[PDB]
């Protein structure tokens, strides 16, 4: 659907960008 570099979180934005954000926000800050 949005494989053309466009998420939109299908309307999850807040929870999907907070959930996704955190997961990758820790790019490296917990020895692992």
């Amino acid at each position: 659907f949005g494989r053309t570099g466009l998420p939109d979180l299908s309307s999850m934005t807040e929870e999907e960008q907070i959930a996704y954000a955190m997961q990758m926000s820790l790019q490296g800050a917990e020895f692992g």
């Binding site: 998420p7 979180l9 934005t13 996704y20 954000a21 997961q23 990758m24």
Partner: protein, 78 residues
């Protein structure tokens, strides 16, 4: 006359933005928001994560030592 910030767009897209390290990370929200979406990255809900340190668009990106080698996850909410 600015550096090349580096961020992680929740979607897994690792990229970088062209804002000044001195800016308040808000100008960045303008760019990243324009790149991803004004719905999924509205400067309003635009925030970043550097070492677990969230950064409200009204704070200094430099305050979170956001280097090119490293990135800050761009988290936003509608």
């Amino acid at each position: 006359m600015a550096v090349t910030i580096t961020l992680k767009t929740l979607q897994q897209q690792t990229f970088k933005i062209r804002m000044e390290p001195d800016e308040t990370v808000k100008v960045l929200k303008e760019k990243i928001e324009a790149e991803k979406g004004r719905d999924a990255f509205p400067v309003a809900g635009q925030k970043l994560i550097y070492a677990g340190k969230i950064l409200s668009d009204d704070v200094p990106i430099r305050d979170y030592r956001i280097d090119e080698k490293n990135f800050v996850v761009v988290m936003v909410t509608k």
